[PDB]
Amino acid sequence: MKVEIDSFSGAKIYPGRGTLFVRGDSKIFRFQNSKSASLFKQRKNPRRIAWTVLFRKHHKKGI
Template identity: 40%
Template sequence: MVEHHICTFCGEPLEPGTGKMYVRKDGSIYYFCSPKCQSNYDLKRVPRRVVWTKAGRKALGKE
């Protein structure tokens, strides 16, 4: 059975075999669907304030 993951930043589901897994020194695991999501995470942006993420759309009342 293939594991399905969700992008840590934007909240979109990842297709099996795609994306990138990032493991921090403290053992926490982050999954990214694209370099766009990873660079926004590296810039310490909050997903609630970014309009195109699921959390951002929910915060704006669009979904």
Template identity: 40%
Template sequence: MVINTELCALSEYRIYPGNGKLMIRRDGRPIWLGTSKAYGLTVQRKKAAKLVWTQAWRRLHKKGISETASKKRTRRVGKVQRAVVGASLEDIKKKAAQKSEIRKDAKEAAIKELKDRKAANKAKSGGAKGKVAKPHTFQKVPKHMGGASKRAGTQR
């Protein structure tokens, strides 16, 4: 539940419902006064900035500011995982959970494929330009040698 409170014009303390006095000046400006102390001092035309116990004086002399500043510094923004366009939150989590090796393999495979494709493209374009390809020099493959089969070693 939110309670509507006013601020005392002199001390700047909160005024809860049922407390305080509302003085309205000739010019129509309302002045809330929380206590008889505040009222008495206002009638005496005392300045809030010259009374040590008021918030105005404390603000002027920079009291209690360092605590609030240090508190602010500790506050940090936490990282939040969120779904990005085209990738849901689950997909992202799954990818992050995968082992680095698998990811590395996948990456290499992808690069290899890309290279192959590039090479193929190059060959095609090269062929179209009419570059004379070197005639294949067939190496004479020796026919089955008798000794080869007899050789001991790898058997398939």
């Protein structure tokens, strides 16, 4: 089994968790839960959502 990564929040997705969204341009997005899925559908920016690994990397959190 392989752990995937949430395309919005960077969270680890274990088998069966969350959803997979295939955009019209054939790009694949993986969401660990409906919260990240809903923020993505709302077009929020992960760099502006403060608990995401993208936000934390951009704001040098944890390093």
